C-alpha cells in the first residue's frame, strides 16, 4: 500500500510529473499534488483536461512513471522528500473512478494509475 | 531565450522532473527549482548526486524532457503555471558548466540541458 509520508506530500502544494512511452521517445506531463485522489491502497486518480498525447501513449503502453514531492515534508536523510511511483494507467470517462474527480468540471476523463511500487527517492 | 515567466518559476519552490529514454521504457528523476542554474539563452545546469541510470540513458540517447512549475506564478487562466522543456543532455565534471553548480559540495557532475523548446503548458 501507499506509505504515510506519501500522504503527507499530498497535503502540500506541488507539481506532479507523469511520464509515458511515445513512438519516438518519452512524453512528460503534469498535474498538481492536490488533484490526486487515492482510492483503496493502490489507485491514484488524476483529472484529465488535455493529456491527448499521454492517452495515446497509455493506450499502447500502459506503464507509467509518476514523481511528486515537497520541500515541507521531512525525507529519509534531511528536509524535503519525494516519491517515484511506477504503475499501469487507464482512462475512464464514466463510473466511480471518473466520479472521484468529477468535481473538476473541466475534466474530460479520469487517469487511473494502479500503483505497483512507490519508492521514496529523497 | 527562456521567457520571464520561466525565471519567475525558478524563484519559487518546487520539484523539477527530468525524463530520459531507457532500454525498456522511460526513466524519471527529480531536482529542486532552486537548484537549477541558467547559463545563457538556452542552457540549464542541474547538480548531479545520483542520476546513474539517467547518465547511462543519456549516453545512449541524449534527448531529454524537463517539467517544472509553481502555484504562485501567473499562468494563462489565473494563478499557477508550468513549462515543458525539450532538449539534449550532457554530463560535465569540469569547466564553467560544473563551476555553475559547484556550490553543491555533493555534486559528482553537472547535468547540462541545452534547450530546444520551452512550452508554457498552463
Ligand atoms: C503544474 C501543471 C498542472 C497541470 N495540471 C493538469 C491536470 O490536472 N490535468 C490535465 O489534463 N493537464 C494538466 N496540465 C497540462 C498537462 O501537463 C499537459 O500539458 C496537457 O494535459 C496536454 O497533455 P498531452 O501533451 O499529453 O496532450 C498541467 C500542467 C502543469 C504545468
Ligand atoms: C525532490 C527531489 C529532489 C532531488 N534532487 C536531486 C538532485 O538535485 N540531484 C540528484 O542527483 N538527485 C536528486 N534527487 C534524486 C533523483 O531524483 C534520483 O532518484 C537519483 O539521482 C537517482 O537517479 P537514477 O535513478 O537516474 O540513478 C532528488 C529527488 C527528489 C524527490
Ligand atoms: Cl498542489
Ligand atoms: Cl526549490
From Swiss-Prot, chains A, B:
Names of the cofactor(s): FMN
The UniProt record lists the keyword Ligase: no
InterPro entries, A to Z: Pyridox_Oxase_N, Split_barrel_FMN-bd
GO cellular component, one term: cytoplasm
Location in or out of the cell: Cytoplasm
Assigned keywords, A-Z: Cytoplasm, Electron transport, Flavoprotein, FMN, Transport
Pfam families documented for this protein: PNPOx_N (PF01243)
Predominant localisation class: cytoplasm
Described function: Functions as a redox protein with a potential of -325 mV.
Subunit structure: Monomer and homodimer.
Protein name: FMN-binding protein
Naturally occurring in which organism (per UniProt): Nitratidesulfovibrio vulgaris (strain DSM 19637 / Miyazaki F)
